Amino acid sequence: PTSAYERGQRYASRLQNEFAGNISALADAENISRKIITRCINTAKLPKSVVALFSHPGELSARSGDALQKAFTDKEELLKQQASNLHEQKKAGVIFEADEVITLLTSVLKTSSA
């Protein structure tokens, strides 16, 4: 298939041009729940580097991207920085995968694992 990120970028544009920022419209157009369009679009709002943490962009779920996007709203810098962190780690041969990535990214905001 095509990753959420991809789907997201596409939706986002049709949203902006073809439908003047009206979700419902785009949703009807694509014939799919509004939520989906939301999840994908928010996923595409994620910094390139974060997507880069995954072997294939398709490994970032519409659902996790969305969750991620929201969790880091007004914290893009933080996200970016913590991302390069994880990049440097796998640059050092460390190997995490999908589910582990999104969890690592998030740990930062949590007093818990932090």
Q: Under rule CB under 8 A, how many of the chain's residues touch its own copies?
A: 23
Q: What is the C-alpha separation between 15 and 95, in angstroms, rounded?
A: 37
Tell me 59's DSSP state: G
Q: Which of 12, 39, 46, 101 contacts DNA by CB under 7 A?
A: 39
Q: Residue 97 half-sphere exposure, CB side, CA atoms within 13 Å?
A: 0
Chain centroid, CA 111 distance in Å: 22
CB of 54 to DNA, least distance (A): 12
The reply to whether 23 sits near its own copies by the rule CB under 8 A is no
**Interaction of residue 70 with its own copies, rule CB under 8 A:** no
User: Which of 103, 21, 4 minimizes the C-alpha distance to 60?
Assistant: 4
The one segment of 44-52, 57-65, 79-87, 89-97 that binds DNA by CB under 7 A: 57-65
The single residue among 99, 107, 110, 113 that binds DNA, judged by CB under 7 A, is 99
